[PDB]
Design an enzyme around this catalytic site. Structure first.
Site, PDB file in Angstrom:
ATOM      1  N   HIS A  41       0.810  -1.225   0.000  1.00 58.04           N
ATOM      2  CA  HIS A  41       0.000   0.000   0.000  1.00 58.04           C
ATOM      3  C   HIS A  41       0.853   1.289   0.000  1.00 58.04           C
ATOM      4  O   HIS A  41       0.284   2.372   0.029  1.00 58.04           O
ATOM      5  CB  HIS A  41      -1.081   0.024   1.096  1.00 58.04           C
ATOM      6  CG  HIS A  41      -0.590   0.195   2.497  1.00 58.04           C
ATOM      7  ND1 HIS A  41      -0.651  -0.846   3.412  1.00 58.04           N
ATOM      8  CD2 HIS A  41      -0.132   1.303   3.128  1.00 58.04           C
ATOM      9  CE1 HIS A  41      -0.191  -0.352   4.549  1.00 58.04           C
ATOM     10  NE2 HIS A  41       0.141   0.935   4.426  1.00 58.04           N
ATOM     11  N   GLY A 143       2.076   5.568  10.055  1.00 56.39           N
ATOM     12  CA  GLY A 143       3.493   5.547   9.715  1.00 56.39           C
ATOM     13  C   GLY A 143       4.234   4.383  10.345  1.00 56.39           C
ATOM     14  O   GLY A 143       5.428   4.197  10.099  1.00 56.39           O
ATOM     15  N   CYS A 145       3.368   1.314   9.602  1.00 51.23           N
ATOM     16  CA  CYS A 145       3.260   0.241   8.609  1.00 51.23           C
ATOM     17  C   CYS A 145       4.634  -0.144   8.118  1.00 51.23           C
ATOM     18  O   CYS A 145       5.482   0.726   7.921  1.00 51.23           O
ATOM     19  CB  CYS A 145       2.340   0.622   7.452  1.00 51.23           C
ATOM     20  SG  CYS A 145       0.715   1.230   7.958  1.00 51.23           S
TER      21      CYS A 145
HETATM   22  C1  LIG Z   1      -2.598   2.663   4.855  1.00 52.39           C
HETATM   23  O1  LIG Z   1      -2.956   2.770   6.235  1.00 52.39           O
HETATM   24  C2  LIG Z   1      -4.256   2.297   6.622  1.00 52.39           C
HETATM   25  C3  LIG Z   1      -4.068   1.850   8.101  1.00 52.39           C
HETATM   26  O2  LIG Z   1      -4.970   1.347   8.759  1.00 52.39           O
HETATM   27  N1  LIG Z   1      -2.847   2.096   8.617  1.00 52.39           N
HETATM   28  C4  LIG Z   1      -2.501   2.121   9.979  1.00 52.39           C
HETATM   29  C5  LIG Z   1      -1.914   1.056  10.654  1.00 52.39           C
HETATM   30  N2  LIG Z   1      -1.672   1.029  11.971  1.00 52.39           N
HETATM   31  C6  LIG Z   1      -2.012   2.096  12.684  1.00 52.39           C
HETATM   32  C7  LIG Z   1      -2.611   3.256  12.142  1.00 52.39           C
HETATM   33  C8  LIG Z   1      -3.014   4.364  12.928  1.00 52.39           C
HETATM   34  C9  LIG Z   1      -3.619   5.443  12.350  1.00 52.39           C
HETATM   35  C10 LIG Z   1      -3.852   5.474  10.983  1.00 52.39           C
HETATM   36  C11 LIG Z   1      -3.483   4.425  10.189  1.00 52.39           C
HETATM   37  C12 LIG Z   1      -2.855   3.278  10.741  1.00 52.39           C
HETATM   38  C13 LIG Z   1      -5.133   3.560   6.627  1.00 52.39           C
HETATM   39  C14 LIG Z   1      -6.602   3.207   6.532  1.00 52.39           C
HETATM   40  O3  LIG Z   1      -6.873   2.428   5.357  1.00 52.39           O
HETATM   41  C15 LIG Z   1      -6.119   1.286   5.250  1.00 52.39           C
HETATM   42  C16 LIG Z   1      -6.693   0.254   4.530  1.00 52.39           C
HETATM   43  C17 LIG Z   1      -5.968  -0.901   4.305  1.00 52.39           C
HETATM   44  C18 LIG Z   1      -4.691  -1.005   4.811  1.00 52.39           C
HETATM   45 CL1  LIG Z   1      -3.711  -2.374   4.366  1.00 52.39          CL
HETATM   46  C19 LIG Z   1      -4.131  -0.008   5.586  1.00 52.39           C
HETATM   47  C20 LIG Z   1      -4.840   1.171   5.798  1.00 52.39           C
END
Ligand SMILES: CO[C@@]1(C(=O)Nc2cncc3ccccc23)CCOc2ccc(Cl)cc21
Ligand SMILES: CO[C@@]1(C(=O)Nc2cncc3ccccc23)CCOc2ccc(Cl)cc21
Lengths: 304, 304
Positions: A41, A143, A145
């Site tokens: 992603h 961030g 991820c």
């Molecule tokens: C790309 O990041 C996303 C996410 O959840 N990441 C996160 C992971 N951990 C903590 C997080 C704290 C606050 C914000 C996002 C966080 C955003 C929402 O949509 C999505 C949809 C799918 C995937 Cl595979 C990731 C995501």
């Protein structure tokens, strides 16, 4: 003596942490040899997350579109590929700090350490477990991820988790190091619900064995039970069914304390039915299930 | 989102861990520059621990009597001295992995990470706090002595604890990096009792602020209280008196959530008087006091 939710020393994994940027998106990557692994992603914008065709998004991305920064130096991306939900960026320089590693897919119930990262920089480390519903109860902000989950066998790092998603319920979803998600989760910004979270029975038994080893013996009773009788009670309390394999794995802790596994089950049965009654076990007011029997022996013997 | 008892990444401290042997005794040492620090009880036998004259024991020890082993290589001890309850062994080689460091004496209530070691090898890492009675609730087995407690400010390691003793109650006692014990503890095998363990009030308030930040808001009530009224209740529950400094330090978390510090005190007062009633806060069935307000902001902002 003493019993903590102790994580593995993270130094060997810190040396693998890099910052991966793609356009506006910046997350973490894991650099082992001449390959940097990261969640696929990274190629998405916030609008792309709603309905992404990663094959199509990836076509409009070239080797120079990915910016890998290790520490404060830039790495040269000479190749890129998508393996399931992870991007594998081949760089021209092998990581001088690459430890002995394995990419392993753990089973629910297993526990690993997470090195939470931001911008390729490790911010902290904690121990957590793969929930029976294939989620983890991590501590991740935007961030984080690309942060990895790992186990260590003397000098070998077994990478098992890569963080991708936070579910609306605040729980975390991720993939093994081959890009395959744990559970039914998809890397799409769509409503995905976490299934029933059950309690990893064999682990609670292991932490009860750990408690007895550390002097906390109040919960020990005069009773025993059968596997089938214990399981009827475990079922009602949304606890994982206990199998003969779990009893086998508890063998070492049973031998260490001289308390049979079914005697410990009866103590657990009464704890489930009667409650803690205001008391604590290992400073905990609830039954802890994020210590495998292997974690208990390791912490109570001193495996380095 | 998510809130874990997250320790600092230990890589910078692993690179300092060495094995120190003196005769039959083997514990851990901390090698920074050309100096290896370790508990002075390395010169004792089990009979010496009952009543040791460290000045006298040390006289019958020379530079060659201390064996410092880093990884698998032997270090040359060219000088030795006793600073309070720590031995400072000057070696001929400066540690190539010596990070930027400070030796700091923390206050009770402060939290640090511990890298538990055995034979100069790190076995695990966990977060813990200096109890108001100057003990720590660590996880240490025989041979963990010399393991350090530390904090990290970007790239600087602030060493604050060195493990020396396990008290009969299973709690741990140690020194700062200048050899001075925290509390009344002496490095003698004599009955030493741990004083009253109080709950670090400002930290429980910080973890309540952390809970609100992560969605767990059930404990929030319609009431407020005064500093004096809250403290009468805190006193009864063996909770630390809350001062204006503690309220000041909670300022950032008060601003983040829009919940005044005295409103949060009233929620804590009701939690103390009414109990959890079967409910959990951040997956915990009891009030957590091993997160300073600085730990909460760091974990909820992403300080690397
Ligand atoms: C790309 O990041 C996303 C996410 O959840 N990441 C996160 C992971 N951990 C903590 C997080 C704290 C606050 C914000 C996002 C966080 C955003 C929402 O949509 C999505 C949809 C799918 C995937 Cl595979 C990731 C995501
Ligand atoms: C020298 O070690 C002692 C000790 O407590 N060390 C330990 C510290 N941690 C965990 C331990 C687990 C099991 C066994 C010992 C542990 C032994 C008892 O007498 C004493 C007396 C004084 C001192 Cl400064 C240390 C000690």
């Amino acid at each position: 003596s003493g019993f903590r939710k102790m994580a593995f020393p993270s130094g060997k994994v810190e040396g693998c942490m890099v910052q991966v940027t793609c356009g506006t998106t910046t997350l973490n990557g894991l650099w082992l040899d001449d390959v940097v692994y990261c969640p696929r992603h990274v190629i998405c914008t916030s609008e792309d997350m709603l309905n992404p065709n990663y094959e199509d998004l990836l076509i409009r991305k070239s080797n120079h579109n990915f910016l890998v920064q290790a520490g404060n130096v830039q790495l040269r991306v000479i190749g890129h590929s998508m393996q399931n939900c992870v991007l594998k960026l081949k760089v021209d320089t092998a990581n001088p700090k690459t430890p002995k590693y394995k990419f392993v897919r753990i089973q629910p119930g297993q526990t690993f350490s997470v090195l939470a990262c931001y911008n390729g920089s490790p911010s902290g480390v904690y121990q957590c477990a793969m929930r029976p519903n294939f989620t983890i109860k991590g501590s991740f902000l935007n961030g984080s991820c690309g942060s990895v989950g790992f186990n260590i066998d003397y000098d070998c790092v077994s990478f098992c988790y890569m963080h991708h998603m936070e579910l609306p319920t605040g729980v975390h979803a991720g993939t093994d190091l081959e890009g395959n998600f744990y559970g039914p989760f998809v890397d799409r910004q769509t409503a995905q619900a976490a299934g029933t979270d059950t309690t990893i029975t064999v682990n609670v038994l292991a932490w009860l064995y750990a408690a007895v080893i550390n002097g906390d013996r109040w919960f020990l009773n005069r009773f025993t039970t059968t596997l089938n009788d214990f399981n009827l009670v475990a079922m009602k309390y949304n606890y994982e069914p206990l199998t003969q394999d779990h009893v086998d794995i508890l063998g070492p802790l049973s031998a260490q304390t001289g308390i049979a596994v079914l005697d410990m089950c009866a103590s657990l049965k009464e704890l489930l039915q009667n409650g803690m009654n205001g008391r604590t076990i290992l400073g905990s007011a609830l039954l802890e299930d994020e210590f495998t029997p292997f974690d208990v022996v390791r912490q109570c013997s001193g495996v380095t």
